[PDB]
C-alpha cells in the first residue's frame, strides 16, 4: 500500500521487505505536546458542565440509533467561552480519551501545513486525515489572547479560523460524510461576539466556561496536591478563600512553585506555611 517504508534492493531495485511507517505519530507528536492526557480524575469543578457535554459527544459515538427515533439531527459543534481559567483544553482530550477516538487540533503553526499536502484550502486535506481515521475530534487551538483584543486585526485574523469552522460545519451539513466529526471552541470574550455575528444563533451548542469558584478550588487543590509529599496538618478550607479570582492555571503556580522553597529548606515533607508563601507570590503579579 502507498505511504509505507519498504527495503529497496540494489540490483533489480525491487522491494526486498516491508517495513512500518509513521504518519499519524507525527500528528500525535504535536498532539501530546500541546495537550497532556488528563483523564476525568485530574479535573474537578466542571461536573455540572461535563454532564452537559457528555450527551453531546457520546451520542454520535454510542447512541445514534435513537437519533432517528427522536427525529433530532446530530450536533455539529460546541463552544466554551469564559475567563481563563483552564480545563477547557483538557476536557476536549479527556472526553476523546474516554471515547478512544483520535484528537486533532487546528493550526498549529507551521508544520501542519507541510505534513499535510503541499498547499491548498488546508481545511480539506486535514479533513481527509480525519476521514481516514474516524471517529475524530477537532479542536480550535488557540488564538485566545488580549493581543488580539483589538477586534480590528485580531478579529479579522481569527475570523479566517471562524471561517474554518464555518466551512467545516458547512461541509458536514452540506456534503461529504459522515458523523463523529465535531469541533470545540475555547476562547474568552471579544471575538466570541464576532463568532456570534458569524453564527446567527445557527447552529452550535452553547456551553459557558466558568471562572474558578471556592468550592471548585478545594477539590482541584487536592488534585494537583496529589503528586507532592506533604503532611496532613494543612487546612484546605482557609487556603482557598485567600485566592479570589486569579485563574485555573494559578493553582499549579501555588503548588509547584511552593515546592522550590521546601527544596531550598532541604525538608522532605513540606508545611502549610510553605504553600501559603507561594500564595503571596502569585498575588503580587496581579
Amino acid at each position: 500500500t502507498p505511504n509505507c517504508r519498504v527495503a529497496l534492493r540494489n540490483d533489480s531495485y525491487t522491494l526486498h521487505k516491508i517495513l512500518p511507517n509513521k504518519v499519524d505519530p507525527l500528528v500525535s507528536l504535536m498532539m501530546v505536546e500541546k495537550v497532556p492526557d488528563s483523564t476525568y480524575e485530574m479535573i474537578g469543578g466542571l461536573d455540572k458542565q461535563i454532564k452537559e457535554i457528555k450527551e453531546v459527544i457520546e451520542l454520535p459515538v454510542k447512541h445514534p440509533e435513537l437519533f432517528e427515533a427522536l427525529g433530532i439531527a446530530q450536533p455539529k459543534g460546541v463552544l466554551l467561552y469564559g475567563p481563563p481559567g483552564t480545563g477547557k483544553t483538557l476536557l476536549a482530550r479527556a472526553v476523546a480519551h474516554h471515547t478512544d477516538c483520535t484528537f486533532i487540533r487546528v493550526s498549529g503553526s507551521e508544520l501542519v501545513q507541510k505534513f499535510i499536502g503541499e498547499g491548498a484550502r488546508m481545511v480539506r486535506e486535514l479533513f481527509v486525515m480525519a476521514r481516514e481515521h474516524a471517529p475524530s475530534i477537532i479542536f480550535m487551538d488557540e488564538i485566545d489572547s488580549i493581543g488580539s483584543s483589538r477586534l480590528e486585526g485580531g478579529s479579522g485574523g481569527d475570523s479566517e479560523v471562524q471561517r474554518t469552522m464555518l466551512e467545516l460545519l458547512n461541509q458536514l451539513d452540506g456534503f461529504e460524510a459522515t458523523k463523529n466529526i465535531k469541533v470545540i471552541m475555547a476562547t474568552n470574550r471579544i471575538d466570541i461576539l464576532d463568532s456570534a455575528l458569524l453564527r446567527p444563533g445557527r447552529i452550535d451548542r452553547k456551553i459557558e466556561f466558568p471562572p474558578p469558584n471556592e468550592e471548585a478550588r478545594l477539590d482541584i487543590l487536592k488534585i494537583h496536591s496529589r503528586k507532592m509529599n506533604l503532611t496532613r496538618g494543612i487546612n484546605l478550607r482557609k487556603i482557598a478563600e485567600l485566592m479570589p479570582g486569579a485563574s485555573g492555571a494559578e493553582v499549579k503556580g501555588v503548588c509547584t512553585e511552593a515546592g522550590m522553597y521546601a527544596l531550598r529548606e532541604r525538608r522532605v515533607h513540606v508545611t502549610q506555611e510553605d504553600f501559603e508563601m507561594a500564595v503571596a507570590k502569585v498575588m503580587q503579579k496581579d
Partner: peptide
Amino acid sequence: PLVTVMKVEK
C-alpha cells in the same frame, strides 16, 4: 492537491 477537494459526493 486540488482534485481531492471536489469529491465526494455528497
